[PDB]
Design a protein around this ligand. Structure first.
Ligand SMILES: NC(=O)c1cccnc1
Length: 167
C-alpha cells in the first residue's frame, strides 16, 4: 500500500490523475518525483519551471553545480538529485523536445530511466511544452515502464481525453 490518492488505474503498474505534480509532491512527499528536464537542467517553464519555483530556486542552484561538474545530460538520459521540499529525490529525465527537432524514438529511452525506481510520481514525458502528442507519451509509458508510476496530468481537458482514448 502507498499514499497516492484519487488515481485511476490504467494497468497493473500505471496510474493517472488530473493534478499539478508540484502540489501532488507537496502532499505525498514521494520517494521520487520526476522532472521534465532539458539537457542543461535549465528549469525555466512547465513541469521544470513549476517544480523549481516550488523549491525557491534551490533545484536550479543544485542543478547548476551538477552541470558545472558533469556537463549536460543526454536526450533520453537522467540524473538523480535532491527532491528538496517536494520529495526525497528528483529524477531529472530528458525527453525529446519536438520544438527542437529531437528524435521521438528517444521517448522510450527516456521512460526506461523510470525502471530504476520502484515507485515514482511523474509527468508525461515530452508532453506539455516539449511538443509531443501526450496520447503517444502515455502509450510509450505503459509499454516501457514496469515499475509503479503515478502520472499527474496538469490539464483537466487533456486528462479526460487521455482516459477516454486509452486502449
Ligand atoms: N504549475 C505549472 O505551471 C505546471 C505546468 C505543467 C505541469 N504542472 C504544473
Amino acid at each position: 500500500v502507498n499514499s497516492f490518492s484519487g488515481y485511476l488505474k490504467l494497468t497493473d503498474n500505471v496510474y493517472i490523475k488530473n493534478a499539478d505534480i508540484v502540489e501532488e509532491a507537496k502532499k505525498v512527499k514521494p520517494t521520487v518525483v520526476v522532472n521534465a528536464a532539458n539537457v542543461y537542467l535549465k528549469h525555466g517553464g512547465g513541469v521544470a519551471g513549476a517544480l523549481n519555483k516550488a523549491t525557491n530556486n534551490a533545484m536550479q542552484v543544485e542543478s547548476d553545480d551538477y552541470i558545472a561538474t558533469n556537463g549536460p545530460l543526454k536526450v533520453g538520459g537522467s540524473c538523480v538529485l535532491s527532491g528538496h521540499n517536494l520529495a526525497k529525490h528528483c529524477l531529472h529525465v530528458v525527453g525529446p523536445n519536438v520544438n527542437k527537432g529531437e528524435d521521438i524514438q528517444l521517448l522510450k529511452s527516456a521512460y526506461e530511466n523510470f525502471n530504476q525506481h520502484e515507485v515514482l510520481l511523474a509527468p508525461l514525458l515530452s508532453a506539455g511544452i516539449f511538443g509531443a502528442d501526450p496520447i503517444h507519451s502515455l502509450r510509450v509509458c505503459v509499454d516501457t515502464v514496469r515499475t509503479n508510476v503515478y502520472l499527474a496530468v496538469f490539464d483537466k481537458n487533456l486528462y479526460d481525453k487521455l482516459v477516454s482514448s486509452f486502449l
